[PDB]
Design a protein around this motif. Structure first.
Motif, PDB file in Angstrom:
ATOM      1  N   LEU A 100      26.309  14.337 -16.088  1.00 24.81           N
ATOM      2  CA  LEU A 100      26.198  15.705 -15.596  1.00 24.81           C
ATOM      3  C   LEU A 100      26.734  15.822 -14.180  1.00 24.81           C
ATOM      4  O   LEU A 100      27.489  16.750 -13.871  1.00 24.81           O
ATOM      5  CB  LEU A 100      24.743  16.166 -15.647  1.00 24.81           C
ATOM      6  CG  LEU A 100      24.226  16.720 -16.974  1.00 24.81           C
ATOM      7  CD1 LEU A 100      22.787  17.182 -16.819  1.00 24.81           C
ATOM      8  CD2 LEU A 100      25.107  17.858 -17.462  1.00 24.81           C
ATOM      9  N   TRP A 101      26.366  14.882 -13.315  1.00 21.44           N
ATOM     10  CA  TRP A 101      26.868  14.841 -11.947  1.00 21.44           C
ATOM     11  C   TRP A 101      28.376  14.604 -11.896  1.00 21.44           C
ATOM     12  O   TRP A 101      29.082  15.206 -11.074  1.00 21.44           O
ATOM     13  CB  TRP A 101      26.109  13.764 -11.166  1.00 21.44           C
ATOM     14  CG  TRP A 101      26.505  13.635  -9.735  1.00 21.44           C
ATOM     15  CD1 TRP A 101      26.352  14.569  -8.756  1.00 21.44           C
ATOM     16  CD2 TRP A 101      27.060  12.476  -9.102  1.00 21.44           C
ATOM     17  NE1 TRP A 101      26.812  14.079  -7.559  1.00 21.44           N
ATOM     18  CE2 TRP A 101      27.247  12.794  -7.743  1.00 21.44           C
ATOM     19  CE3 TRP A 101      27.430  11.206  -9.554  1.00 21.44           C
ATOM     20  CZ2 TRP A 101      27.788  11.889  -6.831  1.00 21.44           C
ATOM     21  CZ3 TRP A 101      27.965  10.308  -8.649  1.00 21.44           C
ATOM     22  CH2 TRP A 101      28.138  10.654  -7.302  1.00 21.44           C
ATOM     23  N   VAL A 102      28.898  13.740 -12.769  1.00 21.48           N
ATOM     24  CA  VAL A 102      30.318  13.430 -12.684  1.00 21.48           C
ATOM     25  C   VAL A 102      31.191  14.489 -13.335  1.00 21.48           C
ATOM     26  O   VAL A 102      32.418  14.382 -13.252  1.00 21.48           O
ATOM     27  CB  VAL A 102      30.675  12.054 -13.285  1.00 21.48           C
ATOM     28  CG1 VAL A 102      29.908  10.943 -12.579  1.00 21.48           C
ATOM     29  CG2 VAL A 102      30.489  12.029 -14.780  1.00 21.48           C
ATOM     30  N   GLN A 116      37.705  12.133  -2.524  1.00 24.24           N
ATOM     31  CA  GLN A 116      37.821  10.910  -3.310  1.00 24.24           C
ATOM     32  C   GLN A 116      36.459  10.245  -3.460  1.00 24.24           C
ATOM     33  O   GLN A 116      35.700  10.156  -2.489  1.00 24.24           O
ATOM     34  CB  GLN A 116      38.806   9.936  -2.652  1.00 24.24           C
ATOM     35  CG  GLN A 116      40.215  10.486  -2.470  1.00 24.24           C
ATOM     36  CD  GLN A 116      41.021  10.507  -3.751  1.00 24.24           C
ATOM     37  OE1 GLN A 116      40.838  11.380  -4.597  1.00 24.24           O
ATOM     38  NE2 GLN A 116      41.930   9.548  -3.896  1.00 24.24           N
ATOM     39  N   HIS A 117      36.155   9.777  -4.680  1.00 23.31           N
ATOM     40  CA  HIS A 117      35.006   8.938  -5.030  1.00 23.31           C
ATOM     41  C   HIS A 117      35.232   8.112  -6.289  1.00 23.31           C
ATOM     42  O   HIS A 117      35.701   8.630  -7.310  1.00 23.31           O
ATOM     43  CB  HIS A 117      33.721   9.754  -5.193  1.00 23.31           C
ATOM     44  CG  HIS A 117      33.163  10.270  -3.906  1.00 23.31           C
ATOM     45  ND1 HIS A 117      33.543  11.465  -3.340  1.00 23.31           N
ATOM     46  CD2 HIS A 117      32.219   9.751  -3.088  1.00 23.31           C
ATOM     47  CE1 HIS A 117      32.880  11.643  -2.211  1.00 23.31           C
ATOM     48  NE2 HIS A 117      32.066  10.620  -2.038  1.00 23.31           N
ATOM     49  N   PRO A 118      34.907   6.817  -6.244  1.00 21.71           N
ATOM     50  CA  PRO A 118      34.986   5.992  -7.459  1.00 21.71           C
ATOM     51  C   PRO A 118      33.930   6.332  -8.496  1.00 21.71           C
ATOM     52  O   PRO A 118      33.997   5.812  -9.616  1.00 21.71           O
ATOM     53  CB  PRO A 118      34.796   4.563  -6.928  1.00 21.71           C
ATOM     54  CG  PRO A 118      34.128   4.737  -5.597  1.00 21.71           C
ATOM     55  CD  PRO A 118      34.679   6.005  -5.039  1.00 21.71           C
ATOM     56  N   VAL A 164      10.394  12.049  -0.611  1.00 26.16           N
ATOM     57  CA  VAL A 164      10.890  10.683  -0.769  1.00 26.16           C
ATOM     58  C   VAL A 164      12.094  10.452   0.137  1.00 26.16           C
ATOM     59  O   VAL A 164      12.214   9.413   0.798  1.00 26.16           O
ATOM     60  CB  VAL A 164      11.236  10.404  -2.243  1.00 26.16           C
ATOM     61  CG1 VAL A 164      12.058   9.130  -2.369  1.00 26.16           C
ATOM     62  CG2 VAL A 164       9.970  10.312  -3.077  1.00 26.16           C
ATOM     63  N   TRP A 165      13.009  11.422   0.171  1.00 20.00           N
ATOM     64  CA  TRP A 165      14.187  11.301   1.025  1.00 20.00           C
ATOM     65  C   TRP A 165      13.794  11.183   2.493  1.00 20.00           C
ATOM     66  O   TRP A 165      14.332  10.348   3.231  1.00 20.00           O
ATOM     67  CB  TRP A 165      15.104  12.505   0.825  1.00 20.00           C
ATOM     68  CG  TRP A 165      16.346  12.438   1.649  1.00 20.00           C
ATOM     69  CD1 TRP A 165      17.472  11.723   1.375  1.00 20.00           C
ATOM     70  CD2 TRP A 165      16.575  13.083   2.906  1.00 20.00           C
ATOM     71  NE1 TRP A 165      18.399  11.901   2.371  1.00 20.00           N
ATOM     72  CE2 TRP A 165      17.871  12.728   3.326  1.00 20.00           C
ATOM     73  CE3 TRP A 165      15.814  13.934   3.713  1.00 20.00           C
ATOM     74  CZ2 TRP A 165      18.424  13.192   4.517  1.00 20.00           C
ATOM     75  CZ3 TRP A 165      16.364  14.394   4.894  1.00 20.00           C
ATOM     76  CH2 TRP A 165      17.656  14.020   5.287  1.00 20.00           C
ATOM     77  N   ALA A 166      12.851  12.016   2.931  1.00 25.80           N
ATOM     78  CA  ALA A 166      12.416  11.980   4.322  1.00 25.80           C
ATOM     79  C   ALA A 166      11.688  10.678   4.634  1.00 25.80           C
ATOM     80  O   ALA A 166      11.815  10.139   5.736  1.00 25.80           O
ATOM     81  CB  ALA A 166      11.536  13.191   4.624  1.00 25.80           C
ATOM     82  N   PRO A 213      18.711  17.438  11.461  1.00 29.57           N
ATOM     83  CA  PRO A 213      17.974  18.700  11.304  1.00 29.57           C
ATOM     84  C   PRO A 213      17.345  18.868   9.936  1.00 29.57           C
ATOM     85  O   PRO A 213      16.446  19.703   9.786  1.00 29.57           O
ATOM     86  CB  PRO A 213      19.045  19.767  11.562  1.00 29.57           C
ATOM     87  CG  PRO A 213      20.331  19.091  11.218  1.00 29.57           C
ATOM     88  CD  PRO A 213      20.158  17.658  11.630  1.00 29.57           C
ATOM     89  N   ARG A 214      17.788  18.107   8.933  1.00 31.41           N
ATOM     90  CA  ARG A 214      17.261  18.282   7.585  1.00 31.41           C
ATOM     91  C   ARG A 214      15.826  17.775   7.483  1.00 31.41           C
ATOM     92  O   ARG A 214      15.075  18.193   6.593  1.00 31.41           O
ATOM     93  CB  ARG A 214      18.166  17.570   6.578  1.00 31.41           C
ATOM     94  CG  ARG A 214      17.778  17.774   5.121  1.00 31.41           C
ATOM     95  CD  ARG A 214      18.770  17.103   4.185  1.00 31.41           C
ATOM     96  NE  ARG A 214      18.335  17.164   2.795  1.00 31.41           N
ATOM     97  CZ  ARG A 214      19.136  16.998   1.752  1.00 31.41           C
ATOM     98  NH1 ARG A 214      20.428  16.758   1.904  1.00 31.41           N
ATOM     99  NH2 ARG A 214      18.628  17.074   0.525  1.00 31.41           N
ATOM    100  N   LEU A 215      15.419  16.894   8.392  1.00 28.03           N
ATOM    101  CA  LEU A 215      14.073  16.336   8.339  1.00 28.03           C
ATOM    102  C   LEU A 215      13.065  17.382   8.794  1.00 28.03           C
ATOM    103  O   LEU A 215      12.662  17.403   9.963  1.00 28.03           O
ATOM    104  CB  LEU A 215      13.985  15.087   9.211  1.00 28.03           C
ATOM    105  CG  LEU A 215      14.709  13.849   8.682  1.00 28.03           C
ATOM    106  CD1 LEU A 215      14.743  12.756   9.736  1.00 28.03           C
ATOM    107  CD2 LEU A 215      14.049  13.351   7.409  1.00 28.03           C
TER     108      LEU A 215
HETATM  109  C1  LIG Z   1      23.327  15.711  -3.857  1.00 27.06           C
HETATM  110  O1  LIG Z   1      23.834  14.635  -4.592  1.00 27.06           O
HETATM  111  C2  LIG Z   1      25.097  14.211  -4.163  1.00 27.06           C
HETATM  112  C3  LIG Z   1      26.207  15.004  -4.422  1.00 27.06           C
HETATM  113  C4  LIG Z   1      27.466  14.599  -4.006  1.00 27.06           C
HETATM  114  C5  LIG Z   1      27.610  13.390  -3.330  1.00 27.06           C
HETATM  115  C6  LIG Z   1      26.512  12.597  -3.076  1.00 27.06           C
HETATM  116  C7  LIG Z   1      25.240  13.007  -3.492  1.00 27.06           C
HETATM  117  C8  LIG Z   1      26.686  11.258  -2.320  1.00 27.06           C
HETATM  118  N1  LIG Z   1      27.053  11.488  -0.932  1.00 27.06           N
HETATM  119  C9  LIG Z   1      26.187  10.736  -0.035  1.00 27.06           C
HETATM  120  C10 LIG Z   1      24.978  11.625   0.279  1.00 27.06           C
HETATM  121  C11 LIG Z   1      24.009  11.817  -0.690  1.00 27.06           C
HETATM  122  C12 LIG Z   1      22.914  12.618  -0.429  1.00 27.06           C
HETATM  123  C13 LIG Z   1      22.787  13.228   0.808  1.00 27.06           C
HETATM  124  C14 LIG Z   1      21.574  14.112   1.092  1.00 27.06           C
HETATM  125  O2  LIG Z   1      21.586  15.322   0.748  1.00 27.06           O
HETATM  126  O3  LIG Z   1      20.564  13.628   1.666  1.00 27.06           O
HETATM  127  C15 LIG Z   1      23.758  13.037   1.781  1.00 27.06           C
HETATM  128  C16 LIG Z   1      24.855  12.236   1.517  1.00 27.06           C
HETATM  129  C17 LIG Z   1      28.454  11.251  -0.638  1.00 27.06           C
HETATM  130  C18 LIG Z   1      29.318  12.454  -1.008  1.00 27.06           C
HETATM  131  S1  LIG Z   1      29.257  12.847  -2.778  1.00 27.06           S
END
Ligand SMILES: COc1ccc2c(c1)CN(Cc1ccc(C(=O)O)cc1)CCS2
Ligand SMILES: Nc1ncnc2c1ncn2[C@@H]1O[C@H](COP(=O)(O)OP(=O)(O)OP(=O)(O)O)[C@@H](O)[C@H]1O
Length: 337
Positions: free
Chosen positions: A23-25, A45-47, A137-139, A161-163
């Motif tokens: 879904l993401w790709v 670009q992304h692999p 979880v991210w924070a 600033p996202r925190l």
């Molecule tokens: C939100 O899912 C995604 C969507 C696209 C991409 C990524 C994650 C991977 N990213 C790294 C990244 C991932 C998450 C955050 C964040 O929102 O905390 C910041 C950078 C590189 C650019 S491609």
């Protein structure tokens, strides 16, 4: 960690992780990205645009672990596991997409059409809490790495600033990651595990706690202004609507005791529409924000009256007297809690 994933949820978890990463790709490719060696934002670009095997194994680990944690959190909040039907889950739908916005990989573009399912607001609020937990979880990850909140983004100071709390969070990134995860949950239900949302906690604690220990502050006039006889009037305007008490108090009123609980104060609680003297009895109606309460006392025949925006409040009976008979004593002074 305490959550143990049942085997059915496990082999559904593997291919739902597959489903989410694919879904993401194609969501990246419909956003307009293209395959490349390095994860460069400007190069576009992304692999990772290719199958999980040639996709970086660390990003595969991230995807699988976040899918596992998503299902584990859904089970941890008590979401009832849902099974639509075994053959319905065996059946897989394909909906073809244009190549430009279609994933480079060979996975199906739409296993499930985002239209034919009406998503219930119960599990929609479940998706809300899921997003809140995911950002938590991210924070936590950022704090563990040492990142701290800063209005201006700076990598070298690790200031982001996202925190911020989820309610205070930026609306744009909020809706972005939030709709990504709503469509992920939508897809996991549409695949066949129609998870049943748990009960909604109607009961609310209503945030009764206050700074420090004191629950109310009593404002009163000076004891010297006590009135012993005559007819007196003052007004109390409620800027907010809530726990207020207004009326007349004796010069011996204790600041720490609530008005009307004792014998030394006569108050009116509009929040409960209830009078207060040596206890509480139902009296009058409730006020709203901005309402003005007029306090009338006649110390000659020992009566007290109350008004709400002009109209005279009255008892359960038709009597307009808030308090019928009381001794003059040492007088009364205006008071509010
Ligand atoms: C939100 O899912 C995604 C969507 C696209 C991409 C990524 C994650 C991977 N990213 C790294 C990244 C991932 C998450 C955050 C964040 O929102 O905390 C910041 C950078 C590189 C650019 S491609
Ligand atoms: N499709 C996806 N959905 C959700 N999360 C993803 C997805 N693809 C990757 N991720 C996660 O996003 C993370 C992004 O890490 P990235 O390298 O961009 O940030 P970082 O190293 O924390 O850097 P900084 O916070 O300093 O910008 C990946 O490590 C992975 O865990």
């Amino acid at each position: 960690s305490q959550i143990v994933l049942p085997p059915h949820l496990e082999r559904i978890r593997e291919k739902l992780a597959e489903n989410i990463h694919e879904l993401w790709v194609m969501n990246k490719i419909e956003l307009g990205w293209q395959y490349g060696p390095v994860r460069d934002d400007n190069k576009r670009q992304h692999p990772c645009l290719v199958e999980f095997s040639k996709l970086p194994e660390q990003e595969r680990n991230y995807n699988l672990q976040m899918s596992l944690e998503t299902l584990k959190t859904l089970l941890a909040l008590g979401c009832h596991v849902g099974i639509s039907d075994e053959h319905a889950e065996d059946k897989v739908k394909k909906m073809k997409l244009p190549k430009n916005y279609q994933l480079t990989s060979g996975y199906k573009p739409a296993p499930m059409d985002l239209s034919f399912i009406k998503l219930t607001p119960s599990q929609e609020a479940m998706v809300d809490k899921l997003a809140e937990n995911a950002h938590n979880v991210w924070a936590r990850d950022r704090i563990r790495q040492g990142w701290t909140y800063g209005i201006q983004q700076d990598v070298k100071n690790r200031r982001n600033p996202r925190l911020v709390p989820y309610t205070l969070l930026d609306d744009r990134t909020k809706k972005s990651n939030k709709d990504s995860l709503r469509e992920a949950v939508r897809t996991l239900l549409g695949y066949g595990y129609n998870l049943e949302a748990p009960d909604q906690d109607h009961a609310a604690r209503a945030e009764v706690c206050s700074g420090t220990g004191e629950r109310f502050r009593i404002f009163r006039a000076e004891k010297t202004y006590a009135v012993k006889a005559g007819r007196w009037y003052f007004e109390f305007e409620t800027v907010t609507a809530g726990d207020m008490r207004v009326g007349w108090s004796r010069p011996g009123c204790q600041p720490d005791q609530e008005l009307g609980s004792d014998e030394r104060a006569f108050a009116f609680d509009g929040f409960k529409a209830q009078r207060w003297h040596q206890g509480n009895e139902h009296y009058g109606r409730s006020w709203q924000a901005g309402d003005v309460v007029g306090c009338m006392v006649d110390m000659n025949e020992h009566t007290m009256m109350f008004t709400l925006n002009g109209e005279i409040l009255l008892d359960d009976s038709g009597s307009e007297l808030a308090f019928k008979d009381f001794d003059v004593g040492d007088g009364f002074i205006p008071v509010c809690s």
